[PDB]
Design a protein around this ligand. Sequence first.
Ligand code: SRM
Ligand code: SF4
Ligand SMILES: [Cl-]
Length: 546
Amino acid sequence: RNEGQWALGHREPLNANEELKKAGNPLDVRERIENIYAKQGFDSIDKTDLRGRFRWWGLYTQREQGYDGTWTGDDNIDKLEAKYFMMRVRCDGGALSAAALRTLGQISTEFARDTADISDRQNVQYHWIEVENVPEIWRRLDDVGLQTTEACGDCPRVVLGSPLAGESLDEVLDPTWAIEEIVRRYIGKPDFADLPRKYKTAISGLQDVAHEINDVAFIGVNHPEHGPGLDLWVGGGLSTNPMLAQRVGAWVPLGEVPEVWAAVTSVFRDYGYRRLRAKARLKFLIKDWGIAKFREVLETEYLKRPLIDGPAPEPVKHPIDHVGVQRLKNGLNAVGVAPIAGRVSGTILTAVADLMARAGSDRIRFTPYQKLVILDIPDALLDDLIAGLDALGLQSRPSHWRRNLMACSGIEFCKLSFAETRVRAQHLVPELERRLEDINSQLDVPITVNINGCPNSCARIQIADIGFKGQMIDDGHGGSVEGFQVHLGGHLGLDAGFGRKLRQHKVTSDELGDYIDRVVRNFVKHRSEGERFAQWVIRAEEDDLR
Ligand code: SRM
Ligand code: SF4
Ligand SMILES: [Cl-]
């Protein structure tokens, strides 16, 4: 029925988005940036470059100051669009050298007003960036192996990796090689530069990469016959319409991973919907077809061969965030630290680089939970590193609250937010820490809290014990305020399922601490012994959850 699908011959633009991509490879702008725009400034920029083609280089326009949730909407673009950019650095597998981390630090301090926030896909993002500076940055970034290619846009985003790839005592294998090949073969090249939408990938020999909600995932497992390799998952995403990615039923040896990845991405390009902008993502195609039909098309049209059947690995009970100290195959140590919802700074990143040098380490990783871990810390030097990290506010022994909270960017910089999230979190974690110290003794089990500024679910609303979806609400009728809809009891891993939404429920941004306190105290009262939060949410009365 013409859903825009390329492989049915229905190859015509059905959107303004699908139409600007018809004007040649979007990645071409790079020349127009270095030739034209970086000299004339923001006003020279074509609106189709500005609001579309820029993304293929991780340049997203940032939110003008002073506008609250009232103004958020597709109709107000010109007002909400400031003369500054968010810039997103692509860090496949989170993996950086000390030198690269220092460069990141200096870029931020000098060009981004010292803004630097670790995203929950292992990237850093800068803000307050002016086009004038973008070539200069690209040049320093490239001088340490980093790029912004396809960091935003209708194309493959960062490939996620285990923050302990190659050093974990519990990894089935180290598939870093696959991630590295995928970047080298496919990233930056025409074949996958124009997809139905954004495309998210996760590859790891641990389940530490939130795979269940990626478009495609290769997660380690021991085939009883064939040994260590990767189980293939497909069809994931959480926005307004959440859906768990599902097992293809396949085992893939490490050597064939880049190949198979290409084939899945190729099906997306050729058979993904390109009609409705909010019905374009792979999860939908997978909902319609079913896995059997998809596996068939992958094997017969693209691979020209069967995939080997394989098992699923035992879903983990608790998630793996790698926070704290752990022993490595090196014999050395890894140390994970927890900022508050990814918020650091140029000064801090540079500070960490010097601590790394003092400790003799040249490897650090960003985390899919907005955290960072440093590898190759010998025992002698461990204590000194930990203390230095604390003095910068990066705790290897954080409280539950600081450890387990995530938030998106929110109204501080984002054009689609109704509420403030990243700054709120900076005050909220401490509040919770002291306000519930009272009860901390009892909390043998962690309560994950995710604060999102709108329904897009960037900080993963539906998979938190306490998820918050920012929206506009009303009180006294002479005031519509910023507040949150509440999702309770979401989780991945064993029996992954989304959180339940509450009936007539709005929590104002001032009440977040009150509400969390209330509910968590109710949790420790009406509680079973050894019971997780997501389980107690099945049964307690609806009054106990408000
Ligand atoms: C930074 C980050 C949040 C964070 O603090 O971690 C983030 C923030 C933004 N996301 Fe994202 N998303 C981020 C992870 C995600 C995730 C989570 C994930 O991948 O695990 C999701 C949910 C999972 C998913 O994609 O299904 C997510 C779903 C969105 C949405 C919803 C899209 C959709 O499929 O309908 C938008 C909007 C869109 O694409 O149209 C989007 C849009 C955005 C934009 C670019 C807003 C915009 O379009 O103007 C945000 C950046 C604005 C700014 O100035 O900061 N981003 N966003 C994460 C970036 C990681 C990265 O390096 O790529
Ligand atoms: S969830 Fe919405 S408000 Fe938060 S960063 Fe993502 S797009 Fe912006
Ligand atoms: Cl995103």
